């Protein structure tokens, strides 16, 4: 279990500054080149910075002058100090251990950085029930529409985690500085409304959690 | 600076099928500094192949790699479901270090028609002053699909936003969500709302509708 754990990522304004940390364990940190990479929302991978065992740093022109990689060989921690941030710095940041042939053999789970002027906003959570006139058979599909939140992420579970099969939770889409996603669940027709169905939506950045029970639409 | 051009961009393979993907560099690069990473959806990339042809830790033997110069390839001897992922090549013989844009591998399976469902605006949302109509198109194959909205039987294009899931790990299908958003006032100037899915699994569209004044 060599391990790398990134922390510190979050929402910051354009022009802001932010420091990421990477805690290394299970190997001798002082004997390795260590590296930050990032993955853009478009799923593109980009080299951000390297730092030799001896503290020599290297950067692509994209962040040169703005980011500073540093290391503490004594607590086994790697840092990325970000400043002069732009929206294009928005990405998931990876801490990576480098080899002598310039491969990355150990990667962290990543920490997410969002650079935006949009304000933190809790989601409105609306139920999706079939129209009052909908017709039956076998399976029903229900839903939760989770709308107008910022920033990513939210997490949705159904029935505090009990219902998990037959779930599709769709990636969020952004419009005019707000996010919307929906989630669908499919359960046996007799199973509803008999078996209560509730979606649970948690929004970390807002200290928001809400639950919405999906009630049949009625005259 | 080295540009790495991967192809194809996206590839679908039958179980058991032999698969080859390619990485093409803008100038000759050293093969000891050419590596491949595999990234499964919702996970970090992982080192897959190092130094052109060396399999990394844990990597099954059906994988291999080769090349030199401006031209490198990764081969999977027999496609397995667990191999569904995006593959990236990366060069480290020149600064700045650079990556290919990735090749996405998907699994082939039997055609399956979407299950389609439409949902009216909730009262909660109308109170706030807005109206979202949602259509789910679930568990279909292949991934190409087209959705058309109509209001009062006329085609409607603005205010629509679509989202797609990644290929499903359990059944290898795809799913889609389509949300048409209106103001409460506009929503209240019309009665009939429809979503139609066109997919190769049928010769007519799947059509789901509702009426603003229904019971
Ligand atoms: C995912 C790719 C990870 C690559 C890790 C990696 C490994 C590595 O050995 C180096 C890396 C990057 O960056 C450069 C800037 C080439 C450093 C020059 C100085 C020294 C001692 C090593 C270089």
Short mmCIF file of C-alpha atoms and ligand atoms in Angstrom, two decimals:
data_model
loop_
_atom_site.label_atom_id
_atom_site.label_comp_id
_atom_site.label_asym_id
_atom_site.label_seq_id
_atom_site.Cartn_x
_atom_site.Cartn_y
_atom_site.Cartn_z
CA UNK A 1 0.00 0.00 0.00
CA UNK A 2 1.99 2.91 -1.30
CA UNK A 3 -0.64 5.65 -1.25
CA UNK A 4 -1.01 9.35 -2.27
CA UNK A 5 -3.84 11.41 -0.84
CA UNK A 6 -4.66 14.85 -2.27
CA UNK A 7 -6.57 17.47 -0.33
CA UNK A 8 -7.37 21.18 -0.39
CA UNK A 9 -9.37 21.44 -3.60
CA UNK A 10 -12.47 23.60 -3.75
CA UNK A 11 -14.15 26.68 -5.17
CA UNK A 12 -12.15 29.89 -5.56
CA UNK A 13 -12.69 33.18 -7.54
CA UNK A 14 -10.79 34.03 -10.69
CA UNK A 15 -7.62 35.72 -9.46
CA UNK A 16 -7.79 33.81 -6.16
CA UNK A 17 -5.12 31.60 -4.60
CA UNK A 18 -5.36 28.08 -3.24
CA UNK A 19 -2.93 25.55 -1.78
CA UNK A 20 -3.21 21.82 -2.52
CA UNK A 21 -1.52 19.17 -0.36
CA UNK A 22 -0.55 15.60 -1.15
CA UNK A 23 0.21 13.15 1.70
CA UNK A 24 2.45 10.30 0.71
CA UNK A 25 2.81 7.00 2.53
CA UNK A 26 4.28 3.51 2.15
CA UNK A 27 7.46 4.38 0.29
CA UNK A 28 10.53 6.48 0.72
CA UNK A 29 9.21 9.87 -0.46
CA UNK A 30 12.67 11.52 -0.41
CA UNK A 31 13.96 9.22 -3.15
CA UNK A 32 11.38 10.22 -5.82
CA UNK A 33 10.55 12.99 -8.25
CA UNK A 34 6.96 13.99 -7.46
CA UNK A 35 4.52 15.59 -9.88
CA UNK A 36 1.12 17.36 -10.22
CA UNK A 37 -1.06 16.59 -13.18
CA UNK A 38 -4.60 17.70 -13.81
CA UNK A 39 -7.55 16.39 -15.82
CA UNK A 40 -9.83 18.95 -17.45
CA UNK A 41 -13.61 18.71 -17.56
CA UNK A 42 -13.03 17.62 -21.19
CA UNK A 43 -11.08 14.59 -19.76
CA UNK A 44 -7.78 15.91 -21.16
CA UNK A 45 -4.62 15.16 -19.11
CA UNK A 46 -2.06 17.95 -18.58
CA UNK A 47 1.30 18.10 -16.81
CA UNK A 48 1.22 20.88 -14.18
CA UNK A 49 4.55 20.70 -12.32
CA UNK A 50 7.49 18.52 -11.34
CA UNK A 51 9.88 18.71 -8.43
CA UNK A 52 13.13 16.78 -8.10
CA UNK A 53 14.15 14.98 -4.89
CA UNK A 54 16.38 18.06 -4.38
CA UNK A 55 13.73 20.72 -4.87
CA UNK A 56 14.46 21.68 -8.48
CA UNK A 57 11.12 22.69 -10.07
CA UNK A 58 9.77 22.59 -13.66
CA UNK A 59 6.62 23.97 -15.21
CA UNK A 60 4.89 24.29 -18.58
CA UNK A 61 4.34 27.90 -19.73
CA UNK A 62 0.59 27.60 -18.96
CA UNK A 63 1.16 27.98 -15.18
CA UNK A 64 4.74 29.22 -15.00
CA UNK A 65 4.84 32.23 -12.70
CA UNK A 66 1.45 31.36 -11.23
CA UNK A 67 1.85 27.92 -9.56
CA UNK A 68 4.65 26.83 -7.21
CA UNK A 69 5.25 23.14 -6.42
CA UNK A 70 7.16 22.44 -3.25
CA UNK A 71 7.91 19.52 -1.00
CA UNK A 72 8.51 18.72 2.69
CA UNK A 73 10.68 15.59 2.68
CA UNK A 74 10.20 15.34 6.44
CA UNK A 75 6.44 15.15 6.80
CA UNK A 76 6.25 13.35 3.42
CA UNK A 77 3.96 16.00 1.88
CA UNK A 78 3.82 17.57 -1.59
CA UNK A 79 2.28 20.99 -2.19
CA UNK A 80 0.90 23.02 -5.09
CA UNK A 81 0.47 26.70 -4.31
CA UNK A 82 -1.94 28.17 -6.87
CA UNK A 83 -2.35 31.94 -7.49
CA UNK A 84 -3.62 34.22 -10.31
CA UNK A 85 -6.17 31.49 -11.03
CA UNK A 86 -8.29 31.37 -14.23
CA UNK A 87 -11.47 29.40 -15.19
CA UNK A 88 -9.25 27.22 -17.34
CA UNK A 89 -7.43 26.11 -14.20
CA UNK A 90 -10.66 24.37 -13.26
CA UNK A 91 -9.79 20.67 -13.14
CA UNK A 92 -9.26 17.65 -11.08
CA UNK A 93 -5.69 17.73 -9.66
CA UNK A 94 -3.61 14.53 -9.31
CA UNK A 95 -0.55 13.93 -7.15
CA UNK A 96 1.71 11.48 -9.00
CA UNK A 97 4.96 9.62 -8.24
CA UNK A 98 7.47 9.84 -11.09
CA UNK A 99 9.91 7.22 -12.29
CA UNK A 100 13.38 7.61 -13.76
CA UNK A 101 11.94 7.13 -17.26
CA UNK A 102 9.32 9.83 -16.76
CA UNK A 103 6.29 7.56 -16.20
CA UNK A 104 3.87 8.04 -13.28
CA UNK A 105 3.60 4.81 -11.37
CA UNK A 106 1.42 5.82 -8.44
CA UNK A 107 -1.54 8.21 -8.60
CA UNK A 108 -3.75 9.72 -5.91
CA UNK A 109 -7.56 9.79 -6.03
CA UNK A 110 -7.49 13.48 -7.00
CA UNK A 111 -8.80 16.76 -5.60
CA UNK A 112 -11.19 19.04 -7.47
CA UNK A 113 -10.57 22.74 -8.05
CA UNK A 114 -13.33 24.99 -9.47
CA UNK A 115 -12.31 28.53 -10.44
CA UNK A 116 -15.52 30.61 -10.79
CA UNK A 117 -17.32 33.83 -9.86
CA UNK A 118 -20.64 31.98 -9.36
CA UNK A 119 -21.71 31.82 -5.69
CA UNK A 120 -22.27 28.72 -3.64
CA UNK A 121 -25.94 27.80 -4.09
CA UNK A 122 -27.96 24.89 -2.66
CA UNK A 123 -30.02 22.74 -5.06
CA UNK A 124 -33.76 22.90 -5.37
CA UNK A 125 -34.96 19.30 -5.35
CA UNK A 126 -38.11 18.45 -7.35
CA UNK A 127 -39.87 15.08 -7.62
CA UNK A 128 -40.51 13.36 -10.94
CA UNK A 129 -43.72 11.36 -10.88
CA UNK A 130 -45.61 10.02 -13.95
CA UNK A 131 -48.51 12.23 -15.13
CA UNK A 132 -51.90 11.64 -13.47
CA UNK A 133 -52.95 10.01 -16.75
CA UNK A 134 -49.85 7.78 -17.27
CA UNK A 135 -50.60 4.09 -18.17
CA UNK A 136 -49.22 1.00 -16.36
CA UNK A 137 -47.19 -2.06 -16.80
CA UNK A 138 -44.62 -4.09 -14.90
CA UNK A 139 -41.91 -1.50 -14.13
CA UNK A 140 -42.41 2.15 -13.19
CA UNK A 141 -39.72 4.83 -13.49
CA UNK A 142 -39.52 7.74 -11.04
CA UNK A 143 -37.08 10.56 -10.56
CA UNK A 144 -35.52 13.48 -8.81
CA UNK A 145 -34.57 16.62 -10.67
CA UNK A 146 -31.78 18.38 -8.72
CA UNK A 147 -31.57 21.88 -10.02
CA UNK A 148 -29.71 25.19 -9.69
CA UNK A 149 -26.80 24.28 -7.39
CA UNK A 150 -23.10 25.35 -7.24
CA UNK A 151 -20.53 24.09 -7.22
CA UNK A 152 -20.09 20.39 -7.96
CA UNK A 153 -20.55 17.93 -6.53
CA UNK A 154 -23.80 16.58 -5.14
CA UNK A 155 -24.49 12.99 -4.27
CA UNK A 156 -27.85 11.31 -4.66
CA UNK A 157 -28.94 8.10 -3.09
CA UNK A 158 -32.30 6.50 -3.13
CA UNK A 159 -33.89 5.27 0.09
CA UNK A 160 -30.78 6.29 2.07
CA UNK A 161 -28.94 3.65 0.00
CA UNK A 162 -31.39 0.74 0.06
CA UNK A 163 -32.37 1.12 -3.60
CA UNK A 164 -29.26 1.00 -5.76
CA UNK A 165 -30.02 -1.28 -8.69
CA UNK A 166 -32.01 0.34 -11.50
CA UNK A 167 -30.54 3.76 -10.79
CA UNK A 168 -29.16 6.11 -13.40
CA UNK A 169 -27.79 9.34 -12.02
CA UNK A 170 -26.85 11.57 -14.92
CA UNK A 171 -23.78 13.86 -15.10
CA UNK A 172 -24.57 17.48 -14.29
CA UNK A 173 -24.89 20.12 -16.91
CA UNK A 174 -23.95 23.73 -16.37
CA UNK A 175 -25.94 26.71 -17.55
CA UNK A 176 -25.54 30.37 -16.61
CA UNK A 177 -23.35 29.55 -13.63
CA UNK A 178 -25.60 26.84 -12.23
CA UNK A 179 -25.70 23.02 -12.27
CA UNK A 180 -28.60 20.64 -12.93
CA UNK A 181 -28.69 16.87 -12.95
CA UNK A 182 -31.45 14.37 -12.67
CA UNK A 183 -31.57 10.83 -11.32
CA UNK A 184 -33.90 8.05 -12.30
CA UNK A 185 -34.89 4.89 -10.46
CA UNK A 186 -36.92 2.00 -11.75
CA UNK A 187 -38.92 -0.24 -9.39
CA UNK A 188 -41.69 -2.89 -9.82
CA UNK A 189 -45.13 -1.40 -10.48
CA UNK A 190 -46.84 -3.00 -7.45
CA UNK A 191 -43.89 -1.83 -5.33
CA UNK A 192 -45.07 1.79 -5.66
CA UNK A 193 -46.55 3.86 -4.06
CA UNK A 194 -46.73 0.97 -1.49
CA UNK A 195 -42.94 0.98 -0.98
CA UNK A 196 -42.00 4.59 -0.19
CA UNK A 197 -39.44 6.02 -2.66
CA UNK A 198 -37.39 9.05 -1.58
CA UNK A 199 -34.26 10.47 -3.12
CA UNK A 200 -31.66 11.88 -0.74
CA UNK A 201 -29.58 14.72 -2.08
CA UNK A 202 -26.50 15.94 -0.26
CA UNK A 203 -24.69 19.14 -1.23
CA UNK A 204 -21.42 19.42 0.78
CA UNK A 205 -20.44 22.98 -0.26
CA UNK A 206 -23.75 24.38 1.02
CA UNK A 207 -24.03 22.18 4.15
CA UNK A 208 -27.29 21.15 2.52
CA UNK A 209 -28.90 17.72 2.58
CA UNK A 210 -32.51 17.18 1.51
CA UNK A 211 -34.95 14.36 1.06
CA UNK A 212 -37.91 14.29 -1.35
CA UNK A 213 -40.56 11.55 -1.32
CA UNK A 214 -42.05 10.86 -4.74
CA UNK A 215 -45.84 11.08 -4.31
CA UNK A 216 -48.27 10.00 -7.04
CA UNK A 217 -49.75 12.89 -9.11
CA UNK A 218 -53.53 13.17 -8.36
CA UNK A 219 -56.86 15.03 -8.96
CA UNK B 1 6.63 20.44 -28.32
CA UNK B 2 5.39 16.89 -28.96
CA UNK B 3 1.79 16.39 -30.01
CA UNK B 4 0.47 12.84 -29.49
CA UNK B 5 -2.46 11.93 -31.75
CA UNK B 6 -4.36 8.85 -30.71
CA UNK B 7 -6.67 6.79 -32.83
CA UNK B 8 -9.25 5.93 -33.17
CA UNK B 9 -10.99 8.43 -30.90
CA UNK B 10 -13.51 5.84 -29.89
CA UNK B 11 -13.76 2.13 -30.59
CA UNK B 12 -16.31 -0.62 -29.93
CA UNK B 13 -15.24 -4.21 -29.65
CA UNK B 14 -16.99 -7.56 -29.37
CA UNK B 15 -16.10 -9.79 -26.42
CA UNK B 16 -13.10 -11.94 -27.36
CA UNK B 17 -12.09 -9.59 -30.20
CA UNK B 18 -8.48 -8.53 -30.88
CA UNK B 19 -8.09 -4.77 -30.52
CA UNK B 20 -5.30 -2.42 -31.59
CA UNK B 21 -5.06 1.29 -30.81
CA UNK B 22 -2.37 3.72 -32.00
CA UNK B 23 -0.40 6.70 -30.74
CA UNK B 24 1.22 8.99 -33.29
CA UNK B 25 3.86 11.58 -32.36
CA UNK B 26 4.61 14.82 -34.19
CA UNK B 27 8.40 14.14 -34.21
CA UNK B 28 10.50 11.05 -33.49
CA UNK B 29 10.57 10.36 -29.74
CA UNK B 30 12.57 7.90 -27.66
CA UNK B 31 10.76 4.62 -26.93
CA UNK B 32 12.09 4.27 -23.38
CA UNK B 33 9.98 7.34 -22.50
CA UNK B 34 6.66 6.27 -24.05
CA UNK B 35 4.01 4.95 -21.68
CA UNK B 36 0.27 4.09 -21.58
CA UNK B 37 -2.34 4.67 -18.86
CA UNK B 38 -5.76 3.11 -18.39
CA UNK B 39 -8.61 5.03 -16.82
CA UNK B 40 -11.84 3.35 -15.77
CA UNK B 41 -14.87 5.70 -15.38
CA UNK B 42 -15.04 7.20 -11.87
CA UNK B 43 -11.40 6.21 -11.12
CA UNK B 44 -7.92 7.76 -11.48
CA UNK B 45 -5.74 6.86 -14.42
CA UNK B 46 -3.31 3.96 -13.70
CA UNK B 47 0.02 3.09 -15.28
CA UNK B 48 -0.66 0.29 -17.77
CA UNK B 49 2.40 0.00 -19.99
CA UNK B 50 5.83 1.57 -19.52
CA UNK B 51 8.73 1.98 -21.91
CA UNK B 52 6.64 1.09 -25.01
CA UNK B 53 6.15 -2.60 -24.24
CA UNK B 54 6.61 -3.35 -20.55
CA UNK B 55 3.40 -4.35 -18.76
CA UNK B 56 2.94 -2.66 -15.42
CA UNK B 57 1.94 -4.26 -12.16
CA UNK B 58 -1.34 -6.18 -12.11
CA UNK B 59 -1.82 -5.89 -15.86
CA UNK B 60 -3.11 -9.14 -17.45
CA UNK B 61 -1.08 -10.79 -20.18
CA UNK B 62 -3.59 -10.09 -22.98
CA UNK B 63 -2.19 -6.55 -23.05
CA UNK B 64 0.91 -5.62 -25.04
CA UNK B 65 2.48 -2.60 -26.70
CA UNK B 66 4.99 -1.78 -29.39
CA UNK B 67 6.56 0.78 -31.66
CA UNK B 68 9.44 3.24 -31.98
CA UNK B 69 10.01 6.55 -33.74
CA UNK B 70 6.78 8.46 -34.35
CA UNK B 71 4.43 5.48 -34.10
CA UNK B 72 3.35 3.29 -31.16
CA UNK B 73 0.45 0.94 -30.47
CA UNK B 74 -1.37 -0.87 -27.70
CA UNK B 75 -2.97 -4.24 -28.33
CA UNK B 76 -5.48 -6.20 -26.33
CA UNK B 77 -5.44 -9.86 -27.46
CA UNK B 78 -9.01 -10.60 -26.40
CA UNK B 79 -11.40 -7.84 -25.36
CA UNK B 80 -12.92 -8.38 -21.90
CA UNK B 81 -15.68 -6.38 -20.29
CA UNK B 82 -13.28 -5.24 -17.55
CA UNK B 83 -11.25 -3.55 -20.35
CA UNK B 84 -13.86 -0.86 -20.98
CA UNK B 85 -11.92 2.37 -20.32
CA UNK B 86 -10.13 5.30 -21.84
CA UNK B 87 -6.47 4.65 -22.78
CA UNK B 88 -3.89 7.47 -22.87
CA UNK B 89 -0.37 7.50 -24.28
CA UNK B 90 2.22 9.91 -22.78
CA UNK B 91 5.74 10.99 -23.79
CA UNK B 92 8.52 11.95 -21.42
CA UNK B 93 11.58 12.54 -23.63
CA UNK B 94 10.78 16.19 -24.20
CA UNK B 95 9.68 19.11 -22.00
CA UNK B 96 6.78 20.00 -21.72
CA UNK B 97 5.53 16.47 -20.94
CA UNK B 98 2.43 15.76 -23.05
CA UNK B 99 -0.41 13.26 -23.33
CA UNK B 100 -2.54 11.94 -26.18
CA UNK B 101 -6.23 12.89 -25.88
CA UNK B 102 -7.23 9.28 -25.17
CA UNK B 103 -9.03 6.44 -26.92
CA UNK B 104 -12.27 5.26 -25.42
CA UNK B 105 -12.94 1.52 -25.69
CA UNK B 106 -16.53 0.28 -25.46
CA UNK B 107 -18.09 -3.20 -25.45
CA UNK B 108 -20.48 -4.38 -28.22
CA UNK B 109 -23.69 -6.23 -27.25
CA UNK B 110 -27.20 -6.88 -28.62
CA UNK B 111 -29.31 -3.90 -29.74
CA UNK B 112 -31.77 -2.83 -27.07
CA UNK B 113 -34.54 -0.22 -27.38
CA UNK B 114 -34.71 2.71 -24.94
CA UNK B 115 -37.34 2.67 -22.22
CA UNK B 116 -38.74 6.21 -22.40
CA UNK B 117 -40.54 8.25 -19.71
CA UNK B 118 -41.78 11.84 -19.60
CA UNK B 119 -42.47 13.89 -16.47
CA UNK B 120 -44.34 17.13 -15.95
CA UNK B 121 -43.21 20.11 -13.82
CA UNK B 122 -43.77 19.59 -10.10
CA UNK B 123 -45.95 22.01 -8.16
CA UNK B 124 -42.92 22.82 -5.97
CA UNK B 125 -41.11 24.12 -9.07
CA UNK B 126 -44.05 26.12 -10.45
CA UNK B 127 -44.38 28.00 -7.16
CA UNK B 128 -40.78 29.07 -7.66
CA UNK B 129 -41.73 30.37 -11.14
CA UNK B 130 -40.23 27.78 -13.50
CA UNK B 131 -41.21 24.66 -15.43
CA UNK B 132 -38.89 21.78 -16.34
CA UNK B 133 -40.16 18.88 -18.41
CA UNK B 134 -37.97 15.77 -18.12
CA UNK B 135 -37.65 12.79 -20.45
CA UNK B 136 -35.53 9.71 -19.59
CA UNK B 137 -34.30 7.40 -22.32
CA UNK B 138 -32.88 4.39 -20.49
CA UNK B 139 -30.86 1.24 -21.20
CA UNK B 140 -30.43 1.24 -24.99
CA UNK B 141 -27.77 0.03 -27.46
CA UNK B 142 -26.15 1.25 -29.64
CA UNK B 143 -25.37 4.73 -28.18
CA UNK B 144 -26.52 6.85 -31.16
CA UNK B 145 -29.95 8.25 -30.32
CA UNK B 146 -31.93 11.38 -31.15
CA UNK B 147 -34.55 13.17 -29.12
CA UNK B 148 -37.12 15.66 -30.42
CA UNK B 149 -39.35 17.82 -28.23
CA UNK B 150 -42.71 19.21 -29.33
CA UNK B 151 -45.07 21.67 -27.71
CA UNK B 152 -48.64 21.62 -29.08
CA UNK B 153 -47.33 19.33 -31.81
CA UNK B 154 -44.63 21.76 -33.05
CA UNK B 155 -40.90 21.06 -32.82
CA UNK B 156 -39.11 22.91 -30.03
CA UNK B 157 -35.31 23.31 -29.87
CA UNK B 158 -34.39 26.05 -27.36
CA UNK B 159 -34.27 25.42 -23.62
CA UNK B 160 -33.35 21.76 -24.07
CA UNK B 161 -30.32 20.25 -22.30
CA UNK B 162 -29.17 16.64 -22.62
CA UNK B 163 -26.98 14.43 -20.43
CA UNK B 164 -25.61 10.96 -21.15
CA UNK B 165 -24.38 8.20 -18.83
CA UNK B 166 -21.19 6.21 -19.49
CA UNK B 167 -21.67 2.69 -20.83
CA UNK B 168 -23.20 0.61 -18.00
CA UNK B 169 -20.82 -1.83 -16.27
CA UNK B 170 -23.53 -4.43 -15.56
CA UNK B 171 -25.32 -4.61 -18.97
CA UNK B 172 -23.20 -2.58 -21.41
CA UNK B 173 -26.01 -0.23 -22.37
CA UNK B 174 -26.32 3.55 -22.47
CA UNK B 175 -28.87 5.95 -20.95
CA UNK B 176 -29.87 9.55 -21.65
CA UNK B 177 -31.67 12.38 -19.94
CA UNK B 178 -33.35 15.32 -21.73
CA UNK B 179 -34.70 18.33 -19.89
CA UNK B 180 -36.82 21.07 -21.53
CA UNK B 181 -37.01 24.13 -19.32
CA UNK B 182 -39.57 26.93 -19.67
CA UNK B 183 -40.84 29.81 -17.57
CA UNK B 184 -44.12 29.21 -15.75
CA UNK B 185 -45.84 31.79 -17.92
CA UNK B 186 -44.68 30.24 -21.21
CA UNK B 187 -45.42 26.76 -19.87
CA UNK B 188 -48.92 27.98 -19.09
CA UNK B 189 -49.52 29.23 -22.70
CA UNK B 190 -49.53 25.69 -24.09
CA UNK B 191 -51.13 22.37 -23.36
CA UNK B 192 -49.39 19.41 -25.00
CA UNK B 193 -45.80 18.30 -24.33
CA UNK B 194 -44.04 15.49 -26.15
CA UNK B 195 -40.66 13.78 -26.39
CA UNK B 196 -39.85 11.47 -29.32
CA UNK B 197 -36.84 9.17 -29.45
CA UNK B 198 -35.44 7.96 -32.76
CA UNK B 199 -33.16 4.89 -32.46
CA UNK B 200 -32.20 2.15 -34.90
CA UNK B 201 -34.13 -0.48 -32.92
CA UNK B 202 -37.40 0.78 -34.37
CA UNK B 203 -38.81 2.06 -37.65
CA UNK B 204 -41.08 4.60 -35.92
CA UNK B 205 -40.08 6.88 -32.97
CA UNK B 206 -40.98 6.15 -29.36
CA UNK B 207 -43.42 8.92 -28.36
CA UNK B 208 -44.35 9.93 -24.80
CA UNK B 209 -46.66 12.88 -24.03
CA UNK B 210 -48.76 14.63 -21.45
CA UNK B 211 -51.29 17.46 -21.22
CA UNK B 212 -51.10 20.44 -18.85
CA UNK B 213 -54.81 20.02 -18.05
CA UNK B 214 -54.88 16.20 -17.45
CA UNK B 215 -56.58 13.95 -14.82
C1 LIG C 1 2.10 10.91 -15.78
C2 LIG C 1 3.52 11.38 -16.17
C3 LIG C 1 4.36 11.49 -14.91
C4 LIG C 1 5.82 11.94 -15.20
C5 LIG C 1 6.61 11.93 -13.91
C6 LIG C 1 8.05 12.49 -14.09
C7 LIG C 1 9.22 11.77 -13.85
C8 LIG C 1 10.48 12.41 -13.98
O1 LIG C 1 11.60 11.66 -13.81
C9 LIG C 1 10.53 13.76 -14.32
C10 LIG C 1 9.38 14.43 -14.54
C11 LIG C 1 8.14 13.82 -14.47
O2 LIG C 1 9.51 15.71 -14.92
C12 LIG C 1 10.63 16.43 -15.59
C13 LIG C 1 10.25 17.91 -15.65
C14 LIG C 1 10.86 15.76 -16.97
C15 LIG C 1 11.71 16.21 -14.56
C16 LIG C 1 13.14 16.63 -14.96
C17 LIG C 1 13.95 16.33 -13.69
C18 LIG C 1 13.94 14.92 -13.20
C19 LIG C 1 14.96 14.48 -12.14
C20 LIG C 1 12.91 14.11 -13.65
C21 LIG C 1 11.79 14.64 -14.62
#
